[PDB]
Amino acid sequence: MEAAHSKSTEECLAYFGVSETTGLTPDQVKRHLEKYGHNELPAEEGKSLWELVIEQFEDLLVRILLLAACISFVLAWFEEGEETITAFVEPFVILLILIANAIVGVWQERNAENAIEALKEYEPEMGKVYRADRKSVQRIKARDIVPGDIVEVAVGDKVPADIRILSIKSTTLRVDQSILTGESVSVIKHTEPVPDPRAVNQDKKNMLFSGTNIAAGKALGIVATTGVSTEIGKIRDQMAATEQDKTPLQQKLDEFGEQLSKVISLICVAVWLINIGHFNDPVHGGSWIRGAIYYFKIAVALAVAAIPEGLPAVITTCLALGTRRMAKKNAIVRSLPSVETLGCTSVICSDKTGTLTTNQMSVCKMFIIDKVDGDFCSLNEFSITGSTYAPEGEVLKNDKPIRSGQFDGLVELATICALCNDSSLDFNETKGVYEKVGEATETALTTLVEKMNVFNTEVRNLSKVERANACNSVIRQLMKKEFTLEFSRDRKSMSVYCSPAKSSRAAVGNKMFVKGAPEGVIDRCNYVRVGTTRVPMTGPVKEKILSVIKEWGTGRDTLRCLALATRDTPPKREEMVLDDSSRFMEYETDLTFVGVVGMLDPPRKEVMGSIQLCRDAGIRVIMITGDNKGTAIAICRRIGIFGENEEVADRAYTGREFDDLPLAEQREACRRACCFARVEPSHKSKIVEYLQSYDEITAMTGDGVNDAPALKKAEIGIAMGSGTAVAKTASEMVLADDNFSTIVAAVEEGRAIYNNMKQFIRYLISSNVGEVVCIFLTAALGLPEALIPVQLLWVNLVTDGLPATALGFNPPDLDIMDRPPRSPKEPLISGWLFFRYMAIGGYVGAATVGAAAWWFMYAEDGPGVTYHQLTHFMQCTEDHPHFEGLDCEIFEAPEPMTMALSVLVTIEMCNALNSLSENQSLMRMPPWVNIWLLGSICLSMSLHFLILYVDPLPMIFKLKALDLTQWLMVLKISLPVIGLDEILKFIARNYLEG
Numbered sequence: 001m002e003a004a005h006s007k008s009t010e011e012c013l014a015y016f017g018v019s020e021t022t023g024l025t026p027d028q029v030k031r032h033l034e035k036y037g038h039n040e041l042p043a044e045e046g047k048s049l050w051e052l053v054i055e056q057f058e059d060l061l062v063r064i065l066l067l068a069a070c071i072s073f074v075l076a077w078f079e080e081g082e083e084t085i086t087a088f089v090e091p092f093v094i095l096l097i098l099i100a101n102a103i104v105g106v107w108q109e110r111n112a113e114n115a116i117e118a119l120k121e122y123e124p125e126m127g128k129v130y131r132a133d134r135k136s137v138q139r140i141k142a143r144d145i146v147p148g149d150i151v152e153v154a155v156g157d158k159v160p161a162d163i164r165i166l167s168i169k170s171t172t173l174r175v176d177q178s179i180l181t182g183e184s185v186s187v188i189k190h191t192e193p194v195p196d197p198r199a200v201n202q203d204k205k206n207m208l209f210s211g212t213n214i215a216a217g218k219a220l221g222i223v224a225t226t227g228v229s230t231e232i233g234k235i236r237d238q239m240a241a242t243e244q245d246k247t248p249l250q251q252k253l254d255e256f257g258e259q260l261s262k263v264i265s266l267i268c269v270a271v272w273l274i275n276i277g278h279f280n281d282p283v284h285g286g287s288w289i290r291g292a293i294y295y296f297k298i299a300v301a302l303a304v305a306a307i308p309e310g311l312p313a314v315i316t317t318c319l320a321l322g323t324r325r326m327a328k329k330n331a332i333v334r335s336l337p338s339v340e341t342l343g344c345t346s347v348i349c350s351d352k353t354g355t356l357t358t359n360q361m362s363v364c365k366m367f368i369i370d371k372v373d374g375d376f377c378s379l380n381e382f383s384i385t386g387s388t389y390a391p392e393g394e395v396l397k398n399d400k401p402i403r404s405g406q407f408d409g410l411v412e413l414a415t416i417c418a419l420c421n422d423s424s425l426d427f428n429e430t431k432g433v434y435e436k437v438g439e440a441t442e443t444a445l446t447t448l449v450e451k452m453n454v455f456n457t458e459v460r461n462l463s464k465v466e467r468a469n470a471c472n473s474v475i476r477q478l479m480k481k482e483f484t485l486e487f488s489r490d491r492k493s494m495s496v497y498c499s500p501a502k503s504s505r506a507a508v509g510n511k512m513f514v515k516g517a518p519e520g521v522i523d524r525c526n527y528v529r530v531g532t533t534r535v536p537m538t539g540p541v542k543e544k545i546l547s548v549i550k551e552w553g554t555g556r557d558t559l560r561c562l563a564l565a566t567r568d569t570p571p572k573r574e575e576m577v578l579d580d581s582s583r584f585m586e587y588e589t590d591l592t593f594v595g596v597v598g599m600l601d602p603p604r605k606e607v608m609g610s611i612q613l614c615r616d617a618g619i620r621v622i623m624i625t626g627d628n629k630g631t632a633i634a635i636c637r638r639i640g641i642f643g644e645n646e647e648v649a650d651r652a653y654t655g656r657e658f659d660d661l662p663l664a665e666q667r668e669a670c671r672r673a674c675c676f677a678r679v680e681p682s683h684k685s686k687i688v689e690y691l692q693s694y695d696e697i698t699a700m701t702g703d704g705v706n707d708a709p710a711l712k713k714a715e716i717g718i719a720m721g722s723g724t725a726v727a728k729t730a731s732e733m734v735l736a737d738d739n740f741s742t743i744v745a746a747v748e749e750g751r752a753i754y755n756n757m758k759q760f761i762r763y764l765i766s767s768n769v770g771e772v773v774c775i776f777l778t779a780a781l782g783l784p785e786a787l788i789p790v791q792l793l794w795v796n797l798v799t800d801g802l803p804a805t806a807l808g809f810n811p812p813d814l815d816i817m818d819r820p821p822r823s824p825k826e827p828l829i830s831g832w833l834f835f836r837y838m839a840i841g842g843y844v845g846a847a848t849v850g851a852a853a854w855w856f857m858y859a860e861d862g863p864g865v866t867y868h869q870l871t872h873f874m875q876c877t878e879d880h881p882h883f884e885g886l887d888c889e890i891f892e893a894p895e896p897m898t899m900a901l902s903v904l905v906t907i908e909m910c911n912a913l914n915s916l917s918e919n920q921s922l923m924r925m926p927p928w929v930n931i932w933l934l935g936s937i938c939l940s941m942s943l944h945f946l947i948l949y950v951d952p953l954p955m956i957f958k959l960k961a962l963d964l965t966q967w968l969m970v971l972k973i974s975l976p977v978i979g980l981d982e983i984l985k986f987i988a989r990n991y992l993e994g
C-alpha cells in the first residue's frame with residue numbers, strides 16, 4: 001500500500017484485512033509472503049572467478065595477442081634447430097603478460113564495492129511483529145516481515161520496512177531519518193493522515209521509512225510496503241536502472257582497438273598480395289614449409305608491434321600518481337577513469353549549505369517596533385558582532401554597543417529565541433571551540449540570547465562550558481515550556497506553549513511563543529508589541545516590517561529572516577489537539593508581532609574566486625539550495641553566479657515553478673538556469689538528464705542516500721566527506737573538506753593530467769606505427785627479421801614505458817583554466833599530427849630496416865655483401881650469388897638485429913623529447929623542462945645495456961653487444977629524427993593558421 005500516509009489507520013487495517021490487536025494469521029502470512037515476496041533488496045548478481053577471468057580476454061587486442069600466443073607456441077613447437085633455451089620463451093612471455101593482465105583485472109573487481117550492496121547496511125536483521133498465532137510481540141527476521149503486518153518499534157530500533165503508524169505508545173515519537181530526507185534533527189511523528197497523495201517524504205509525518213532509526217518513544221504501526229517498494233527500495237531500483245557510459249578516453253581507446261585489428265588484418269592481406277608471384281614457382285622443391293613459417297612469423301611480430309602493450313600500465317600509473325596528488329588537495333577520486341571526465345566538466349551543480357557556505361550561522365541584525373502613531377511608525381534596528389556560535393560578541397545601534405536589557409522589546413525577543421528553540425551550545429574540548437548542538441539556525445538564536453544578555457548576568461564568572469548556556473538558562477527558569485508545536489513546511493512556523501513558573505497554581509499567564517518564515521507569521525499577527533505595550537497591527541506598520549525584511553533577505557545582506565511573535569491569549573491547554581499538526585496554524589493565530597532576526601550562513605572564503613575560475617574555464621555553476629527564491633538569488637549575486645544587476649527571472653527556479661513548466665520548457669530551463677531553490681531529490685536526477693540531453697559533462701554534489709540516484713547518473717558524482725557512505729560509494733569523487741573550491745581545483749588538475757596523458761599516448765602509439773612499418777617493410781623487401789616479438793615487447797613495456805611515464809609529469813600549460821572545456825569527441829590524433837606520425841613512422845620503419853641491412857652489407861664486421869639483396873633468398877640451396885663457400889646461418893646473426901633495436905630505442909628516446917610539447921621547438925621548450933624525462937632516458941639506456949651484456953639476457957633477446965663504430969652509425973641514423981619533427985613542428989606553427 002504505497003499510499004498509506006494519506007489513508008486513515010482504519011482504512012489501512014481494512015485494506016489488508018488485519019486486526020490491530022491480533023496481527024496477521026498464518027494463512028495471511030503465507031498468502032502475503034507469496035504475493036509481495038520477502039522484505040529485502042535483491043541480491044547482487046554473483047560473478048564467478050571463472051567468469052571474471054574470461055571477461056579479461058574480452059578486449060579485441062588481448063584476443064589478437066592470445067591468437068599471437070598460439071601461433072607463437074605452435075611455431076615454437078616445430079622450430080628448426082635446437083635453441084629450446086631461447087625458443088618457447090616468446091610464447092611464454094606473451095602468455096604471461098595476458099596472465100598478469102588478467103590477474104590485475106580480477107584483483108580490481110574483487111576489492112571493488114557497489115553502492116547498491118551498500119544500501120543493505122540500512123536493512124536490519126530482525127524486526128518485532130504481532131501475529132495471530134501468539135499474543136506476545138514476537139521478533140522475527142526483517143526478511144520475513146510483510147505488508148499488512150502489525151509491527152512494533154522503540155528507541156534505538158532500525159525501521160524494518162515502510163510503516164504507517166497506528167498508535168504511539170510513548171508520549172512522543174522521534175525519528176532520525178536524516179539519511180533519507182536530509183533532516184539532521186530527529187523528527188516528530190503523528191498518526192493522523194496526510195491528505196496529499198503525492199506528499200514528499202518530509203511531509204509524511206505518519207510514516208516510518210525502512211532504514212531509519214527511532215530516536216525516542218515507542219510506536220505500533222502497520223507495514224505498507226516492503227522490498228523494492230519502500231522509499232529506499234525505490235532508490236535502489238533507480239540506481240540499478242542507471243546505465244553509465246564509458247569515459248571519452250575509454251571510448252577513443254575502444255575505437256582505436258577496432259580500427260587497429262582492421263589495419264593488422266589488412267597488412268596481412270597485403271603481405272600476401274605482394275608475394276602472389278610464388279604461385280608461379282615450381283611445385284616440386286622450394287621452401288614450402290619454410291615459407292609458411294616465414295609468413296606466420298611476421299604475423300606474430302606484426303600483432304605484437306601494433307599493440308601498445310604497455311600503454312594501459314602507463315595510464316594506470318599516471319592516474320594513481322595524479323590521484324594521490326589530488327588527495328593532498330582534498331579531492332579523493334574513487335574511480336581513476338573519472339579524472340579525465342572531471343577535466344571535461346562543463347556544468348557543476350552544487351548544494352549550497354556547507355559547500356558554498358560554511359554552515360556556520362550567526363544572527364547579524366534584528367529589529368523590534370519602536371512606536372506606532374497613526375500613519376507614523378519607527379523601528380529599533382540593531383546589529384550583532386561575532387560570526388561564531390560562541391557567545392563572544394555584542395549588540396549595537398548606529399554602530400554603538402548598547403545594553404539589550406534596556407529595551408523591553410528585546411527582552412521578549414530573547415525570551416522567544418530562548419524558549420522557542422530545540423537546540424543548544426557546547427564547548428568542544430577536542431577543538432577548543434564551540435559546536436552547534438542541533439539545527440544551525442536555532443543554535444544561532446541560542447548564541448544571540450547569550451550575546452544579548454537581557455538580564456545582565458555574571459557570565460564572566462563561569463568557564464567556556466558553563467556560560468555556554470548562561471543567559472539561556474536564565475530565561476528558562478522563568479517560563480515553563482509545556483509542549484511544542486513542531487515546525488511544518490506548510491505553515492512555515494513553530495511554537496512552544498509556556499506557563500509561568502513563578503505562578504504554580506495560576507488560572508492565567510500562559511503564552512505561546514512563535515517563530516517562523518516572515519510572511520506566514522506576520523499575516524497571523526493581529527497585534528504589534530511596542531516595548532511592553534501592545535497595539536493593533538495596522539497597514540502602515542506591516543508594510544514597514546515587510547519593507548525591512550525584503551531589504552535584508554533580498555539585498556546585499558543576503559540574510560535568512562525569522563519573524564518572532566507571541567500569542568498573548570493562547571487557547572486553554574485541554575482545548576488543543578497536540579496530535580493533529582493540521583490544526584497548529586490555527587493555534588498560532590491572533591498573534592502579537594515581537595520582532596525579526598536576520599542570520600547569515602557565510603560563503604566560503606575561497607568560493608568567490610573559484611566561481612571566477614569556472615567562468616574563465618567556460619564552466620557553468622548551478623546552485624541548489626533550501627533558501628526561499630529571493631534569498632537564493634541574492635546569494636547567487638553575492639558569490640558571483642549572477643551579476644549584481646543582471647536580470648535572472650528565467651535563470652532561477654523553485655521546485656514548484658519548475659514542475660509547473662511543461663517538459664519542453666523544463667529542458668530549456670536547465671540550459672540557462674544557475675539557481676534552483678527548494679527542489680525535491682527527484683529534481684537533481686531530472687536536472688542531470690536534461691543537461692545530458694545537451695551533451696553537458698555534469699558534476700553533481702550530494703550526501704544522503706536520496707542523492708545516490710543522481711550522484712550515479714551524473715558523469716561526476718561528488719560526495720561530501722562528512723556525508724553518508726552510500727553517497728560516497730555512488731560517487732566518482734569525495735570532498736574531504738566539503739568545499740566547493742576543492743571541486744574547481746580537482747577539475748584543473750583533471751585538465752593538466754589529460755594534456756600530459758595525450759602526450760604519452762601519442763608517444764607510445766606513434767612508436768607502434770613505426771614498429772609496424774619496420775615489420776611490413778621487412779616483408780615487402782623479403783629481408784630477414786630485423787625485430788622479433790620478444791625485443792618489441794621489451795621496448796613497449798620497459799624501454800618506452802619509463803619515458804611515457806615521465807611525460808605524465810610534464811609541466812602544465814599556464815593558461816589551463818583560460819579555455820573552454822575540452823570536447824569529449826576531440827580525437828587524440830588527426831590532421832597534421834596524423835601526417836606527422838606517419839612521416840615519423842615511415843622514418844622509423846626505414847631507420848630500423850636499414851641499420852640491419854647495413855650490417856648484412858656495407859659493414860666492417862659483417863658480411864661485405866653490398867647490394868647483395870637478401871631479398872633474393874634465404875633458402876640457401878642454389879648458391880646463385882656465392883660461387884664458393886659454406887655458410888648461411890648468418891642470416892640469424894644477432895648483430896644486425898642489435899642495430900635495429902638500438903635504432904628503435906635511440907629514436908624512441910629522441911621521440912620522447914619531441915613529445916614534451918606538441919608544437920613547440922626544443923629551442924623554446926628545452927628538454928630540461930622535465931627532469932623526470934631526462935632521468936628516465938638515462939634509466940632506459942642503461943637497461944638497454946643490461947640486456948646486451950648481462951649474459952643470460954643477450955641470448956634470450958637474440959642480441960649482441962655493439963662496436964663503437966656500430967653504435968656511432970646508430971646515433972647517426974637516430975638523432976636526425978629530432979630534426980624531422982622540428983621541421984614538421986615549424987610547418988604547423990607558421991603555415992597552418994586560422
Ligand SMILES: C/C=C(/C)C(=O)O[C@H]1C(C)=C2[C@H]([C@@H]1OC(=O)CCCCCCC)[C@@](C)(OC(C)=O)C[C@H](OC(=O)CCC)[C@@]1(O)[C@H]2OC(=O)[C@@]1(C)O
Binds near residue numbers: 259827
Ligand atoms: C598503431 C599501429 C598502426 C600500424 C596503425 O596502422 O594504426 C592505425 C590506427 C588504428 C589509427 C591510426 C593508424 O593509422 C596509420 O598509421 C595510417 C596508415 C599507415 C599504414 C602502415 C602500414 C605498415 C593513428 C595511430 O595514426 C597516426 C599516424 O597517428 C591515429 C589515431 O589514433 C589515435 O588518435 C589514438 C587514440 C587512442 C586513429 O586514427 C587510429 O584509429 C582510430 O580510430 C584513431 C582515431 O584512434
Ligand SMILES: Nc1ncnc2c1ncn2[C@@H]1O[C@H](COP(=O)(O)OP(=O)(O)O)[C@H]2O[C@@]3(O[C@H]21)C([N+](=O)[O-])=CC([N+](=O)[O-])=CC3[N+](=O)[O-]
Binds near residue numbers: 487515562624628679
Ligand atoms: N520545501 C520547503 N517548504 C518550506 N520551507 C522550506 C522548504 N525547504 C526548506 N525550507 C526552510 O528553509 C530552511 C533551510 O532548509 P534546508 O532544507 O535545510 O535546506 P539546505 O539544505 O539547503 O540548507 C529550513 O529552515 C526552516 O524551514 C526550512 C526550519 N526547519 O526546517 O525545521 C525551521 C524554522 N524554524 O525554526 O522556524 C525555520 C526555517 N526557515 O526557513 O525559516
Ligand SMILES: [Mg+2]
Binds near residue numbers: 182351353
Ligand atoms: Mg544540505
Ligand code: NA
Binds near residue numbers: 712713731
Ligand atoms: Na556518476
